[PDB]
Amino acid sequence: GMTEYKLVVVGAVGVGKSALTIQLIQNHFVDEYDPTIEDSYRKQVVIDGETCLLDILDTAGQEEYSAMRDCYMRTGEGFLCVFAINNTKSFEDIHHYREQIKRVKDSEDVPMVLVGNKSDLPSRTVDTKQAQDLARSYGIPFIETSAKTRQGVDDAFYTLVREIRKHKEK
Amino acid sequence: GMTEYKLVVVGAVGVGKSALTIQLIQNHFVDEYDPTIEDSYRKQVVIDGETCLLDILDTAGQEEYSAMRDCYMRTGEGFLCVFAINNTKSFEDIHHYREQIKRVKDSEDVPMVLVGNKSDLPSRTVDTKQAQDLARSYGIPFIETSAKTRQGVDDAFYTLVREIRKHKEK
Numbered sequence: 001g002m003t004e005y006k007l008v009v010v011g012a013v014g015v016g017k018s019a020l021t022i023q024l025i026q027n028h029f030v031d032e033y034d035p036t037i038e039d040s041y042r043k044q045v046v047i048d049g050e051t052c053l054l055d056i057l058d059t060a061g062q063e064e065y066s067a068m069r070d071c072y073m074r075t076g077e078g079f080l081c082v083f084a085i086n087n088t089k090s091f092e093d094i095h096h097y098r099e100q101i102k103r104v105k106d107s108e109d110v111p112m113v114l115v116g117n118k119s120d121l122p123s124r125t126v127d128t129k130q131a132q133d134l135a136r137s138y139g140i141p142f143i144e145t146s147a148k149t150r151q152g153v154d155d156a157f158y159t160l161v162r163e164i165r166k167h168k169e170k
Numbered sequence: 171g172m173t174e175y176k177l178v179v180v181g182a183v184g185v186g187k188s189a190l191t192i193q194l195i196q197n198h199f200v201d202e203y204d205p206t207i208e209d210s211y212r213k214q215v216v217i218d219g220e221t222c223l224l225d226i227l228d229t230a231g232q233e234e235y236s237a238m239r240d241c242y243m244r245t246g247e248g249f250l251c252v253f254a255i256n257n258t259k260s261f262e263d264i265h266h267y268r269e270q271i272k273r274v275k276d277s278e279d280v281p282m283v284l285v286g287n288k289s290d291l292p293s294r295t296v297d298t299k300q301a302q303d304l305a306r307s308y309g310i311p312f313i314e315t316s317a318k319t320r321q322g323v324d325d326a327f328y329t330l331v332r333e334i335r336k337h338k339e340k
């Protein structure tokens with residue numbers, strides 16, 4: 001029937017993957033979501049005038065040597081690669097997540113969006129220009145979000161769905 | 171793409187799920203593939219003029235409780251439901267796999283193909299009419315295969331892809 005999209009949210013612990021996912025699904029901010037809970041959520045949404053169903057996997061935790069994890073990446077069609085703008089390491093680890101995805105899916109072009117989360121925080125350590133430069137280099141959209149205020153949350157997920165559309169159209 | 175199709179091979183132990191997958195992927199019979207090993211394969215093929223990528227999960231394991239199973243039944247786009255023509259119980263067991271898949275997908279219309287494997291053996295116990303009747307009742311194709319001779323093997327997988335195309339453009 002209507003088009004389904006398998007989305008996977010990856011990124012360092014603490015960056016806001018669960019908060020972003022819950023804002024999208026449940027439209028509220030949860031500020032203490034169990035950091036170890038990994039789960040999938042479905043929601044029917046309208047993007048660009050068309051209804052579609054998002055199946056979203058909020059990852060956690062053991063990253064390497066995990067059959068379950070590798071399976072999510074094989075199956076996933078698009079990936080939100082999240083870092084927190086006050087957490088430089090989480091930004092400088094993005095490449096690790098990207099490498100793992102390209103490895104498991106064995107493809108040079110996989111739909112991804114770079115998400116700089118925690119935009120509401122006054123102290124950043126990652127400049128917008130830096131994130132922009134990395135995303136441009138990767139050939140992927142970059143979007144700043146705040147799960148706390150909800151700014152950019154729909155935009156992050158809709159943009160990824162749009163990247164999946166193109167991939168299919170090419 | 172290059173469309174990708176995610177296929178899942180299911181059915182009772184010993185019916186030939188591995189042998190069918192390995193024939194398709196590696197072009198030879200197997201008589202010594204561990205019954206408990208669950209693994210996935212990729213192959214690029216042309217089906218009806220469409221160059222596409224198959225990602226095939228060869229399932230194994232009869233665990234009453236399985237998070238992985240509930241997962242691949244959710245994400246798999248089409249299901250090869252295999253029984254062996256010399257094994258009456260495996261034929262009966264088809265119902266079990268079908269119903270599991272339906273409940274996980276919450277759908278009566280999940281792309282599947284009924285596969286009657288080991289067609290090379292004279293030791294037959296499940297008649298062609300029985301299998302054709304079961305498939306008709308499910309509204310899915312039935313294909314006779316032999317992973318030994320390779321008879322019907324491409325046709326089984328390709329026909330599942332055709333079922334997926336029908337469903338997607340519904």
Ligand SMILES: Nc1nc2c(ncn2[C@@H]2O[C@H](COP(=O)(O)OP(=O)(O)O)[C@@H](O)[C@H]2O)c(=O)[nH]1
Nearest residue numbers: 013014015016017018019031032118146147148
């Ligand atoms: N200030 C701010 N805090 C956030 C934001 N998103 C998540 N958090 C907080 O960051 C911590 C980790 O968030 P969480 O969703 O559990 O991160 P995860 O481990 O990546 O899933 C929690 O205390 C959240 O309240 C945000 O956009 N802004």
Ligand SMILES: Nc1nc2c(ncn2[C@@H]2O[C@H](COP(=O)(O)OP(=O)(O)O)[C@@H](O)[C@H]2O)c(=O)[nH]1
Nearest residue numbers: 183184185186187188189200201288316317318
């Ligand atoms: N004669 C014959 N033997 C087969 C066929 N398919 C599988 N086998 C044999 O049946 C046994 C079980 O096959 P396997 O693929 O491992 O079954 P699985 O547990 O469903 O994967 C092995 O000894 C295979 O050699 C077939 O089409 N014809």
Ligand SMILES: *CC(=O)c1c[nH]c2ccccc12
Nearest residue numbers: 071176177210225227242246
């Ligand atoms: C590991 C996993 O879940 C996997 C790998 N290939 C697949 C194809 C279809 C469904 C699940 C698959």
Ligand SMILES: *CC(=O)c1c[nH]c2ccccc12
Nearest residue numbers: 006007040055057072076241
């Ligand atoms: C179990 C599984 O593989 C699964 C469930 N929802 C998903 C969304 C995206 C990728 C994998 C998913």
Ligand SMILES: [Mg+2]
Nearest residue numbers: 017018035060
């Ligand atoms: Mg989390």
Ligand SMILES: [Mg+2]
Nearest residue numbers: 187188205230
């Ligand atoms: Mg096997």
